[PDB]
């Protein structure tokens, strides 16, 4: 209540405070507790193999230099005080681009406690790398992580833990990605060794399951409809050369445009995906349908009836094997 | 352990410290050791002729002004101390755009040693120029370098070396580019002379071998399938003018759309690539197939049978010569 008294107390705390030295410098490591509140996952990019996360990132640690007596309150201080305090040198090892939000002020909090506990909060948006296995795309499940580490302090000097254990990360229910469901999240703690020493690590990972629905509509269904279209040829008289050859060409070429378009939406991976396998199967069906007519055409100068039954049935077999293997 | 003692020692180190003067100013050059830990190569762009690298960049040098006694520890200091120290004026001569990561703090480390050795670490993402020879694209091998140099200090004042020799660069195994394999990396050291004097240089280069698989599927296979499609015409009766002319047109025009689309994904180079040679060969085959029908059409108002054998065989020869020359 007495602002001169509080001002005196805080001035005394910061008098001769050396930001260069961690709490308990030269002694046991400072334990830093970390909790995350997820605001959003804005984007997941296959082409860039990354995702964009917004979170409230909070760090908890005790600094005995900041302990104060005679005030039974937690002091919430203006965020600019953070520049006069030691804070951990935490970074995100797999981040590509990150920033602290700055409007209307730096989205930063400092709360001091009488025992010298410092609560330091930041609102961060990060684009973080996530290597994806697209062999089953778009029936794939991905593991995207956020790796949290101390940059310069080893485990001799700093230690990390998930504050609250399995409850340290909140807001996973808020994530609303149209193309993915969050199956699970996990929290891990370990030490990572480099040439410069052993460093504390915290890892947050998510299991993402792709929703098929968009892909059924966008790629699978057009391919099915083109393949069915190709079969119309077999009901046309063999003298209708222009009509039946037109059907063969248009379906074959449409399947090429669909294939090439699709792979321009994705990174230039050297392996075959699940969707590639489907499109290649569909291409073979429609190509053989045209070749069937070439064969009929070839001898006329029963086969059509045989095509009317065998082709749709074979496509059913193809689909059965495919969707069983991958679903 | 005694933080007042450590604070006193460090304050004494920085008292009267002149950041303007290099260590041993006016004396022998300061030797700066450099090690790199590669985190990722995010992107390789043919259109922009550049690549994006993320690395941990560490510099090692001795500054006798920072030597301290009576403390048998290496002092890890808050990264903000870097602003009160001399550091080398290292830059990347072939970089296009670079930044030091800034969340949650500047990804920077300072570790002092009792003898005055300074360890200075930065986490940097750089987009760096890489002129590519696309004459064999996409069967090409590229050499992309990172050129590290002192901006203003000559070899009279500063010297660079790879700290650890051939082990100075780690993490090459981490690089996971879908379109490339890292064949080799090399470390070079030399002096580079300009009008203003001789400057120390360190060069890190990689040999990148393009993976063919994506290109086989995306460009080569469609071209093969269009060329085969063109041959169907030869099994159609010569009276089927609409059917056979349709086949000729559609294949010819599809090969044009494939060509023009492809070169819109690449920079506007004035020379012919390997892929251009293939597409031009395929174009000639399908164009001649249509012209074959024009010739048949021309006289009817044996040639088809001759086309049925000679065309596929010639395409086999074309492919044999091509893939031997380039693979």
């Amino acid at each position, epitope marked *: 209540g007495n602002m001169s008294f509080v001002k005196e107390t805080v001035d005394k705390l910061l008098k001769g405070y050396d930001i260069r030295l961690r709490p308990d410098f030269g002694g046991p490591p400072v334990c830093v507790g970390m909790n995350i509140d997820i605001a959003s996952i804005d984007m997941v990019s296959e082409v860039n193999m990354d995702y964009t996360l917004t979170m409230y990132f909070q760090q908890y640690w005790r600094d005995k230099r900041l302990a104060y007596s005679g005030i039974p309150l937690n002091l919430t201080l203006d965020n600019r005080v953070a520049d006069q305090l030691w804070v951990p040198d935490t970074y995100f090892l*797999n981040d590509k681009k990150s920033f602290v939000h700055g409007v209307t002020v730096k989205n930063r909090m400092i709360r001091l406690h009488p025992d010298g506990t410092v609560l330091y909060g930041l609102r961060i948006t990060t684009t973080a790398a996530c290597m994806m296995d697209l062999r089953r795309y778009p029936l794939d499940e991905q593991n995207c992580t956020l790796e949290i580490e101390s940059y310069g302090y080893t485990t001799d000097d700093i230690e990390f833990y998930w504050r609250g254990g399995d409850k340290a990360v909140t807001g996973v229910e808020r994530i609303e990605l149209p193309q993915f469901s969050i199956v699970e999240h996990r929290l891990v703690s370990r030490n990572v060794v480099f040439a410069t020493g052993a460093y504390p690590r915290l890892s947050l990972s998510f299991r993402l399951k792709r929703n098929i629905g968009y892909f059924i509509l966008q790629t699978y269904m057009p391919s099915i409809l083109i393949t069915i279209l190709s079969w119309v040829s077999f009901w046309i008289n063999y003298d209708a050369s222009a009509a039946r050859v037109a059907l063969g060409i248009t379906t074959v070429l449409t399947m090429t445009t669909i294939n090439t378009h699709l792979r321009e939406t994705l990174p230039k991976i050297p392996y075959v995906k699940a969707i590639d396998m489907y499109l290649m199967g569909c291409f073979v069906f429609v190509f053989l349908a045209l070749l069937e007519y070439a064969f009929v055409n070839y001898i006329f100068f029963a086969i059509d009836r045989w095509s009317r039954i065998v082709f749709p049935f074979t496509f059913s077999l193809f689909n059965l094997v495919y969707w069983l293997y991958y679903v | 352990g005694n933080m007042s003692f450590v604070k006193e020692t460090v304050d004494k180190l920085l008292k009267g410290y002149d950041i303007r003067l290099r260590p041993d100013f006016g004396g022998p050059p300061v030797c700066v050791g450099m090690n790199i830990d590669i985190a990722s190569i995010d992107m390789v762009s043919e259109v922009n002729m550049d690549y994006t690298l993320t690395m941990y960049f560490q510099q090692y040098w001795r500054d006798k002004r920072l030597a301290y006694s009576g403390i048998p520890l290496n002092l890890t200091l808050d990264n903000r101390v870097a602003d009160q120290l001399w550091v080398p004026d290292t830059y990347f001569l072939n970089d296009k755009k670079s930044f030091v990561h800034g969340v949650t703090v500047k990804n920077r480390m300072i570790r002092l040693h009792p003898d005055g050795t300074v360890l200075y670490g930065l986490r940097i993402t750089t987009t760096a120029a890489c002129m590519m020879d696309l004459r064999r694209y996409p069967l090409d091998e590229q050499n992309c370098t990172l050129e590290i140099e002192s901006y203003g200090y000559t070899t009279d004042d500063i010297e660079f070396y790879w700290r650890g020799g051939d082990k100075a660069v780690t993490g090459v*195994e*981490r690089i996971e580019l879908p379109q490339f*394999s890292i064949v080799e990396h090399r470390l070079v050291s030399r002096n580079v002379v300009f009008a203003t004097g001789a400057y120390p240089r360190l060069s890190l280069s990689f040999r990148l071998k393009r993976n063919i698989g994506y290109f086989i599927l995306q460009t080569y296979m469609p071209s093969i399938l269009i060329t085969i499609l063109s041959w169907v015409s030869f099994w159609i009766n010569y009276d089927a003018s609409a059917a056979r002319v349709a086949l000729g047109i559609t294949t010819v025009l599809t090969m044009t759309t494939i060509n023009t689309h492809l070169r819109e994904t690449l920079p506007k180079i004035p020379y012919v690539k390997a892929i251009d040679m293939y597409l031009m060969g395929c174009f000639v085959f399908v164009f001649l197939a249509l012209l074959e029908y024009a010739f048949v059409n021309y006289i009817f108002f044996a040639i088809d049978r001759w086309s049925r054998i000679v065309f596929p065989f010639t395409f086999s020869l074309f492919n044999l010569v091509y893939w031997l020359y380039y693979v």
Partner: nanobody
Amino acid sequence: QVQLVESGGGLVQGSLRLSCAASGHTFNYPIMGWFRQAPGKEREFVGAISWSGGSTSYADSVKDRFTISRDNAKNTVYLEMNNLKPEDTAVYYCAAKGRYSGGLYYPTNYDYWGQGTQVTV
């Protein structure tokens, strides 16, 4: 979740080919390492290979003697131990490293350890 079974050790006087067959979530663990533990001595780095690319690294002791490579079809890594020596007498272990799990050289960075073939010469 990775399982590693290694075989082809034994006792010889000579060229040898240790093999290391992986199964499971190998995507999350792109690096395979070879370690060896002599009786008494600490567990020691031999070499490592990326599954994708085959980017290879060796300890000095075995540089230009041993050769590692793999085949992604079988999910198998092999240590081709040529030009053997009586120093090369240890339980050779195979292990998998996570993508972000630190330096190649340090066995504590590795999660999934093979059984370990004893090799004496």
